From Swiss-Prot:
Protein name, UniProt field: Lipoate-protein ligase A
Function statement: Catalyzes both the ATP-dependent activation of exogenously supplied lipoate to lipoyl-AMP and the transfer of the activated lipoyl onto the lipoyl domains of lipoate-dependent enzymes. Is also able to catalyze very poorly the transfer of lipoyl and octanoyl moiety from their acyl carrier protein.
UniProt cross-references to Gene3D superfamilies, sorted A to Z: Bira Bifunctional Protein, Domain 2, CO dehydrogenase flavoprotein, C-terminal domain
pH dependence: Most active from pH 5.5 to 8.0. Inactive below pH 4.3.
Pfam families associated with the record: Lip_prot_lig_C (PF10437), LplA-B_cat (PF21948)
Disulfide bond entries: none
UniProt keyword annotation of Iron present: no
Originating organism: Escherichia coli (strain K12)
Binding positions ((R)-lipoate): 133
Compartments, record wording: Cytoplasm
Cytoplasm keyword on record: yes
Amino acid sequence: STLRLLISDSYDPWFNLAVAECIFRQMPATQRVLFLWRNADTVVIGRAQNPWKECNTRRMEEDNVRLARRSSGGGAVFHDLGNTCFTFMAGKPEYDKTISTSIVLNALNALGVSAEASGRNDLVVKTVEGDRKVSGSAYRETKDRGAHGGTLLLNADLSRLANYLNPDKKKLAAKGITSVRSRVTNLTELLPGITHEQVCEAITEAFFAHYGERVEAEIISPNKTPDLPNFAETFARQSSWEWNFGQAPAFSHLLDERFTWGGVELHFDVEKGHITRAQVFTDSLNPAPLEALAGRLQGCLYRADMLQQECEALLVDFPEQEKELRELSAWMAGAVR
Ligand SMILES: Nc1ncnc2c1ncn2[C@@H]1O[C@H](COS(=O)(=O)NC(=O)CCCCc2cc3nc4ccc(O)cc4oc-3cc2=O)[C@@H](O)[C@H]1O
């Protein structure tokens, strides 16, 4: 056949992405793939985004909310079990992202909701409060293939959506794509009790309709590594800090705090998750260890656990300022989460 339908029973955002990443390559050029999946408590960012800048990476860590960098573009979005994800995969030149959008759109109309796409990749319903966003999307192409993945806000926690997508005021000069903040709502406010299964059928039946074929859905299990080319390597890298966080565009961070022993200001040049340069500005009466720290951060990870390593390594050479340095390491680690 020409079609392929995949349903994920895994909620690991890293897992499902690794599946697409393995389906996207393994896919025969003549094939047309639909992928239906969900994710439990995650903030998903695009390839060219800065996690610390686009979402509350600190709040997520406190609350065990995973961060995932999708291979496609777009902005930062929050995933929750009331958030349905789809992914249409075709080959060029047959591939068109408007086709997929219409399939989803037709499917929505089959359910009794009347929405239309807008912007670059939104999907907005007309409500009493006006226009509300119930979906977004992002795309990925190569020389011969294509992939249009998107969401659908069925019954996500809108509170946690706002809470994690509202980052701590940080002082950042960052390259990359920034998110386009829109007003959102849940479809359950429109079709009370709409579930993930009900939606999947619509998107599936609309997919089967526009193509005229049918196929039995292939189910993926979480308790088993799917039989895919280099999945084990894919799922491993996709899950790494070096990808989700490291593959952020080059940026800079300005830090400041007024301690009782003086004020300290830090400038961080970060690239591939690594501090390429640290500069200290202080009015402390014993600035020698701080000017020394500035050098010791040459190449250090932009992460709270490695900064504290370098600080507890500094205490050895400068034992007199043990008190002052521990306050410093405590603050420095909390500003980079
Ligand atoms: N879950 C949500 N759904 C819809 N809207 C949401 C959500 N959370 C917060 N929002 C609100 O709207 C804004 C969307 O911002 S945005 O338009 O820049 N950015 C976007 O619209 C990007 C949408 C990305 C959707 C997406 C597309 C994908 N495409 C893929 C394509 C290929 C592949 O292998 C994997 C893929 O995985 C994907 C995962 C995905 O989550 C957020 O800032 C927030 O105010």
